[PDB]
Design a binder for this molecule. Structure first.
Ligand SMILES: C=CC(=O)Nc1ccc(CCSc2nc(N3C[C@H](C)O[C@@H](C)C3)c3c(c2C#N)CC(C)(C)OC3)cc1
Lengths: 156, 578, 580, 578
């Protein structure tokens, strides 16, 4: 639709904090999606740009936008160990139990990558510890398979 | 200019990291004991291509260089994947450029670029190769391959997979030694002696179509043509070229070291004149470049397709053929090619000007033409389009020295580029020479589920690879000329993530299992073009001195900026800056 | 002469078309971007052999030519069949003709031709081949291999096939890396360190014969000697040589491009001097052709001609020199199966050596008169092209298929040009193909549907056919300390007649023995035993002469006029003496 | 000097005889048609190693000799075992002696000998190897491989074998070419193009540990970490170095034939200066041998001697230089497992660096006198030849001319040595240059019993070799660098003969069968090093003229003595005596 939409995806992508103010001010669609269904909030979440995440939520960015495979900005922040972004998304209403097309939750992804500080925050906000993916696997199962005892301790 | 040798290899269906880590690294690690080497650089990309360029000291003999490189590469061949060995790994002197580029076009709408490339390969290239003064000749295209385009719905209908297709083609498009009757040592007094002739290579689509995949239990036959469409086609489809809007192939012809340019060019034109009476209808020869050609760059965004790029090139062509009809002879539009990156989202238009003497006055010279073009093309949305004609610039390599990984080296690269922009006083246009990461589709195979179901992981991986990437199976004989046979999915079954689940694999117990039962996927970013420098991961950075500053002064700041990067990040100067 | 690089490859049991389309074309397609290349030719033969000749401009550095040819070949190497790669592909920079022949005989008659050939290949060839200036060394005979001559009645009697034989040999004639006891890293304080020695290559017929093929249900054993005869025998049986009618072998030696002939011959004689004292009793070197003092006789029968028929003509030639030219001729070294054209069953050559200059007074007793008379005496011999000569106003023409017409139409076109040139005796004398005519071949069609229904696999079918009637190189063994090849093949009597195809069984997936007749059909057809190519396209070389007094230029110009009336798609070029 | 080209190849876990008969002979047989070859020699060793030395006529262009050799070797590559080809065969044109040694230590002891060697292999060697003039680089240590240390008790418990481990590693540490979404040729209207990423090489012990070997019938999971310890460790463990007693690695560098010693040494230093800033903390370069002011000490124990006894002799050598000669000696760099021209458990070398010349005043503190005193002090070491030297009697080859074999050639050598000892007035120190036969463990696989049980020979031989000799499975990526993966038994299950009986193999019926059920063993003697000369079996004899006798008189006597040897035994002069 909008040319500013596209430019907003690109600046959120590349971490350009100032260009994201200027494009919002000028009416850029904060929920503009690229071809894989990633919004500025996804891009900012994946590349760990805290300030951009904050600027976008403040301008009405959809906190639970999903991509063409069912994955939400929280999924991405959780998987790439961006703690402070995980806290911000969860404060702005991110669905802590959002499942993607595979039935994967942010807890599964945090757990698989051994991001402990994030696993705690997710459980804090009501993450379901017994949530199964399409194969039957829980975050606990993931801990046993990766032989990460520290993470196993936390999920009993 | 220092002599350079380029190693070119190809891994069909391979991503940049797969190519780098199974080919590029392995070849780099064997580039020892070669005399007079200054430095080595390489690119590994999403089209399955690696190019390794070795640059030697000035006054090194280029043949000795070529041969030493080639012998090292050839000893490392068994360390490479079979699929790469079978495409051929070429080692060529790359520092000399073209004597001429010859376009072969079709004007009466009866031939595709693949049809034209086959004609050129089988009727023209070799006679041009043996012409007086000619060195290397590069075919811009290939000879035909026999293309088998598989349909997953019909494959599953008959409990078959691509593995079965591949197995059946190796078995039924074959030619082996069968021996003789009465061969030596014989029973003494033998009169009959005769070769035994068994299976011979297949020759046509008809014959591939009758390949028997299996006899059903009710006694009906599944033939290859029941699970696939069958055509002669290209080996590869990454590039689409037009000459003034018409399908085109070409030849890139180099002058043999020591030979005469003008005599060689005339000798080539003469030889192409001999061939013109034998051409099929509407085939014509053009000479877009021959010892005032300029170029137009086209770059579309991340994830943009061939068709979208084509549209833009078509606007570029129409601009030159209408708005510069007085000044432009031709536009040769090459979709899928660039100099700093191949890919569906790039292309390049080679624009041949009419003779100097037919473009009077400054308006109609290259420089004013290119500015006008750039002004007009800057109002194309969804693409960057730059007209340009081919002691001020510099060439910097940022280097991963401590195993940092691509993600961290990118972050260091951004730190350097962000700092260089805070000094517009000293520096201008400081930028990556390469490409940015882009969305890629990550599919994880679940080993537990595949074992529980009795689905073999080679069946899984061959099914995925062969369908979505294509596979070179073996060779056939087309009109007496040996050529390749490729299997791959028909286009409409390998386009989108949903198509993944239409592909079935046969388990140990004969049940058909869809890809979705043992796989999961997600979007992530990664590199469509990995770079290396002296065998370490690298990112090339170009730039120039701000007005009224020396290149030496610009370098000094770049070095000083480079000293403040994260631990483990180094640099080197290369090219013009070495 | 201009320098030539040669590529040679071997595909045991392959017909000419299989060689052309699995080997020759694949290599030929990479032969471009090579400096100072004038032209390229090749033959692909039904002896399983291919030879590609690349001829360079005068003054080309042969080291560099060889290097650049080989570097293009390396592109084709992994696309070649494994059976070709394993024979050892060769790239040589030699003169086309022999510098000398080293003959070997046994004055006690205690060694057959087969033994002498093996002794030469195993103890003498390699060192000659490594001597500087030796471009190409050609064995007149074959090194021994371990030969397993299979019997199909015995194999079928125990539900076995040649595939089980090949498998059993790979598993039990094996050289295993088995590690060490106490190897690094050790448990600290380890004292014992010893290599583990497991299976090692077999060295004898006895060991091969006790290879274990199966245990029956009743605990009885089937050994390889129970289904095959086992002996040392040649890798092939195609080349047999004689010295003054005695069993002989030999080395034919070609000079490397640019090498000094005197120095090279001396180094060969020095190298032979090292071997001589370790010869077994009776063995002797003889020198039947030193480079006038000598000359050769070529023998070329038409394709289809067996060893027997070529021997008979060789016997007539040998008889002639030992009876009629008795007072001139010191020796004849005659080789059956190898000629000028390369190698084939219908070809042979005699190297003749004369007595001393000063024991042959008179002009009728010099090489030219002798050769003249020998050629004259042989001219009457029928179904044979027998010529004597001692090493020019003719032409060398290539008829080329330039439109995918194929071999049958190219023959038709050759014939049209040959018959037309036969009507111009005033300008053209003896215009003839340099090549061979098509011969009957046995075409066998595997019925895929029957094979699939019976549960017989295509690989098992093809291996059984190929191993049995063509022979198969399985792996290596060690003979008297030297690595040598192992071959399986049918014993002769089971691979002689068309009905023998039906006696070979293949085992199905369900354990049933299925005769070849149940899934195959066959018929006679014609095809080529030597397919030629010129610059990468199908070709047929035509030779001839300028008629008496008329110039080569005028004869070529006619041949071009005749060539211009040939069907569409057929062109021509001039090679060799005619190129310049 | 006559130039020499060297071929090196490797077969992990092979004995000398295996190496000689699958590799050495095959290469030798195919070294034809090469110009100016004077002679050829080779060693085939029980470390799995072959060295072939091809020595050329004086004046030969070493460039051309190397190329001719490499090209012949290339056409023989397909005849070699897959296990040898995949190690990568090397061909070099260099001096046999060292130009310099680059030592590397950790001044903060943060890194062991093993860590340092990997750092050097992984970060320094390749660039040094590509430096011009660098003929040969010897690592004094090994690069890391992923080591899978197998446990036979745990394997048998889960009815697995090393075949299953190897199979699973190739399936789960794989790099898959999976094509693209929107790949060419595309359907009309395609908006998206993206690489598909499936399995990628594993990068860590963590990841190798979760390779899923099997799912039990009750649903539980047997992981690779359940049958094996998983760790980074050397590709081999044979070479350990020290610098003044502390842990070390290094590069022993040899000058390319015809290169300039000074320019090459300088270029090596310039290249080391690029690497220093990115060293981990503590890592430090030392310069223990730069070619007057340096010398070596050789250590040769008899074959059969372990690492530990070679170490003890080297400690005595090191001790002496660091205590008795401390006023003249600055450093000792000591290498256990590498010898003057060999590699074995029974050999070592010490590189010794003196203090400044000006600080060693007096004739008795110059190199000649130092080396001579050291030789005297080590002359009475028990069961070791130990001598110090800077860097001429006769060099003789006894040749098997008639297929006599190793045992008989040894008898004949001994007869000649014994006759030479009876002429002390003409011949001194007439000795073998090679190694004596040693005990080896001969194991016979009962083909009948294996077949009666349904145990496959291939599974038996893979089980034996992979466990007791180690097997190179495929590659993986360690901190972005391609490296090898090896499977082998953990040390304690491969130390003693009774351990053979604890390895089990799975029959076709699924029963585990111990190795004792189908094998029998005995002790015997064979060779740890088989030598050949111009293609034939050989044994090198060294010796010299007695005092007051000419070299030529002594040679003449050797020839007389040689003419009385058993039938089939010849000889030749080589090296200094040619
Ligand atoms: C796969 C099909 C295919 O490639 N088709 C296809 C068909 C025709 C062409 C020729 C287009 S015309 C052309 N192509 C060039 N290329 C050579 C390059 C090394 O790879 C090619 C990609 C493009 C160059 C010049 C011209 C011109 N004029 C001028 C100079 C300045 C010398 O730079 C090189 C190219 C591709």
């Amino acid at each position: 639709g909008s040319d500013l939409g596209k430019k907003l995806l690109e600046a959120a992508r590349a971490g350009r904090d100032d260009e994201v103010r200027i494009l919002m001010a000028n009416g850029a669609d904060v929920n503009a999606a690229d071809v894989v269904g990633w919004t500025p909030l996804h891009l900012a979440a994946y590349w760990g740009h805290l300030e951009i995440v904050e600027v976008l939520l403040k301008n009405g960015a959809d906190v639970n936008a999903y991509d063409t495979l069912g994955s939400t900005p929280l999924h991405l922040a959780a998987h790439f160990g961006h703690l402070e972004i995980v806290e911000v998304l969860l404060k702005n209403g991110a669905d802590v139990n959002a499942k993607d097309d595979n039935g994967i939750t942010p807890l599964h992804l945090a757990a698989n990558r051994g991001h402990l500080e994030i696993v705690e925050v997710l459980l804090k906000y009501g993450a379901d510890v017994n949530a199964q993916d399409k194969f039957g696997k829980t975050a606990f199962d993931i801990s046993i398979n990766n032989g990460n005892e520290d993470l196993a301790e936390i999920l009993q | 200019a220092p002599p350079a040798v380029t190693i070119s290899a190809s891994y069909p269906g391979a991503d940049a990291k797969t190519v780098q880590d199974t080919v590029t690294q392995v070849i780099e690690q064997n580039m020892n004991g070669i005399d007079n080497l200054m430095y080595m650089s390489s690119n590994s990309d999403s089209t399955g291509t690696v190019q390794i360029t070795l640059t030697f000291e000035s006054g090194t003999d280029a043949d000795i260089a070529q041969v030493q490189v080639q012998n090292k590469l050839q000893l490392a061949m068994p360390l490479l994947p079979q699929e790469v060995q079978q495409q051929g790994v070429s080692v060529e002197k790359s520092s000399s450029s073209f004597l001429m580029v010859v376009g072969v076009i079709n004007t009466d709408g009866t031939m595709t670029q693949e049809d034209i490339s086959d004609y050129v390969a089988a009727n023209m290239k070799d006679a041009i190769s043996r012409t007086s003064g000619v060195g290397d000749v590069q075919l811009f295209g290939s000879q035909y391959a026999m293309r088998i385009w598989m349909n997953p719905n019909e494959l599953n209908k008959f409990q078959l997979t691509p593995v079965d297709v591949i197995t059946a083609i190796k078995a039924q498009n074959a030619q082996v030694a069968a021996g003789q009757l009465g061969g030596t040592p014989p029973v003494k007094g033998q009169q009959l002696n005769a070769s035994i002739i068994a299976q011979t290579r297949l020759t046509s689509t008809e014959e591939f179509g009758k390949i028997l995949l299996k006899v059903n239990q009710d006694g009906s036959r599944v033939l290859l043509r029941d699970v696939a469409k069958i055509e002669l086609g290209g080996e590869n489809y990454d590039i689409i070229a037009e000459f003034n809007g018409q399908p085109a192939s070409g030849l890139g012809i180099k002058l043999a070291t020591g030979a005469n340019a003008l005599d060689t060019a005339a000798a080539i034109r003469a030889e192409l004149a001999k061939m013109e009476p034998f051409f099929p209808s509407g085939l014509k020869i053009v000479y877009p470049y021959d010892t005032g050609v300029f170029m137009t760059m086209v770059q579309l965004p991340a994830g943009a397709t061939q068709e979208r790029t084509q549209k833009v090139l078509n606007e570029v062509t129409h601009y030159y053929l209408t708005k510069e009809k007085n000044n432009v002879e031709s536009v040769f539009a090459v979709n899928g090619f660039g100099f700093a990156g191949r890919g569906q989202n790039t292309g390049i238009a080679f624009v041949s000007l009419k003779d100097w003497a037919d473009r009077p006055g400054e308006e109609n010279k290259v420089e004013a033409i290119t500015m006008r073009a750039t002004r007009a093309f800057s109002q194309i949305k969804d693409a960057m389009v730059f007209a340009f004609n081919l002691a001020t610039g510099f060439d910097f390599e940022l280097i991963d020295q401590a195993g940092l990984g691509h993600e961290k080296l990118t972050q260091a690269r951004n730190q350097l580029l962000a700092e260089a922009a805070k000094h517009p006083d000293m520096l201008t246009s400081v930028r990556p020479n390469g490409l940015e990461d882009t969305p890629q589709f990550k599919i994880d195979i679940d080993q537990e589920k595949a074992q529980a179901l009795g689905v073999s992981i080679n069946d899984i991986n061959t099914t995925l690879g062969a369908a979505w990437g294509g596979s070179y199976v073996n060779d056939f004989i087309d009109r007496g000329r040996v050529k390749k046979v490729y299997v791959m999915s028909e286009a409409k079954y390998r386009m989108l993530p949903d198509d993944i689940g239409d592909w079935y694999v046969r388990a140990a117990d004969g049940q058909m299992v869809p890809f979705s039962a043992f796989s999961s996927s997600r979007w992530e970013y990664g590199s469509p073009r990995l770079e290396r420098y002296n065998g370490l991961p690298s990112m090339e950075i170009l730039g120039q001195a701000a007005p009224g500053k020396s290149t030496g002064e610009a370098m000094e700041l770049m070095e000083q900026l480079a000293s403040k990067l994260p631990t483990g990040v180094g640099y080197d100067w290369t090219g013009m800056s070495y």
